[PDB]
Design a binder for this molecule. Structure first.
Ligand SMILES: NS(=O)(=O)c1ccc2[nH]c(=O)oc2c1
Length: 209
């Protein structure tokens, strides 16, 4: 059972701007996704401060980076609060309509794409390097769902029958053919140290066979 949705016009606009603007500093996508993960981990930690059973779905609060050269995928896994199906459909828990509005006025006021995170829509910077993005997520109050979009104005949502997650969010970046440098260990290490040195959760860079 696969449901296909149309992006709001403003989100489709943001997404094609990210895809079509000439902008060489693509590495900031990883900063933005790790920062998104850190925010989601902050949310579940805060909830657990008064209700410890909120961590029954997983006590470890961490971020994993998983490159797969055979699949040409970079996966960012976090054990944060996750997203409901409603969150997924509602622009993955963001206020993307007003955020895109503010982001695009800033761009004409001198800003560049690297500042996308200050407007709450940093997730969509994934399309700087990915031709397709799959988001697997599990929230304590909902089932496991899979969101997917290759841009083009639509996304799909289905119940995820894959590996049970426990709690959190998994962002699978199906990388563009010329963007495989972000599968290389030393390149990911460089980016994490440059942009994410003060993230308050363990970031584990998986290695490959
Ligand atoms: N902007 S739209 O009229 O909603 C639209 C139009 C064509 C599409 N093809 C696709 O995959 O998503 C689409 C969304």
């Amino acid at each position: 059972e696969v449901e296909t949705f149309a992006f709001q016009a403003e989100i489709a606009q943001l997404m094609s701007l990210i895809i079509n603007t000439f902008y060489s500093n693509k590495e900031i996508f990883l900063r933005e996704l790790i920062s998104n993960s850190s925010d989601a981990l902050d949310k579940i930690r805060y909830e657990s401060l008064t209700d410890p059973s909120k961590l029954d779905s997983g006590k470890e609060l961490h971020i994993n980076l998983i490159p797969n050269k055979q699949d040409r995928t970079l996966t960012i896994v976090d054990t944060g609060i996750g997203m409901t199906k409603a969150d997924l459909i509602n622009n993955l828990g963001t206020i993307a309509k007003s955020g895109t509005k503010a982001f695009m006025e800033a761009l004409q006021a001198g800003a560049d794409i690297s500042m996308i995170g200050q407007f709450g829509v940093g997730f969509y910077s994934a399309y700087l390097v990915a031709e397709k993005v799959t988001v697997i997520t599990k929230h304590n109050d909902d089932e496991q769902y899979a969101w997917e979009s290759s841009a083009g104005g639509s996304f799909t949502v289905r119940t995820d029958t894959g590996e049970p997650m426990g709690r959190g969010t998994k962002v699978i970046l199906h990388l563009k053919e010329d963007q495989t440098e972000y599968l290389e260990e030393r390149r990911i290490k460089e980016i994490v140290k440059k942009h994410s040195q003060f993230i308050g959760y363990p970031i584990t860079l998986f290695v490959e066979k």
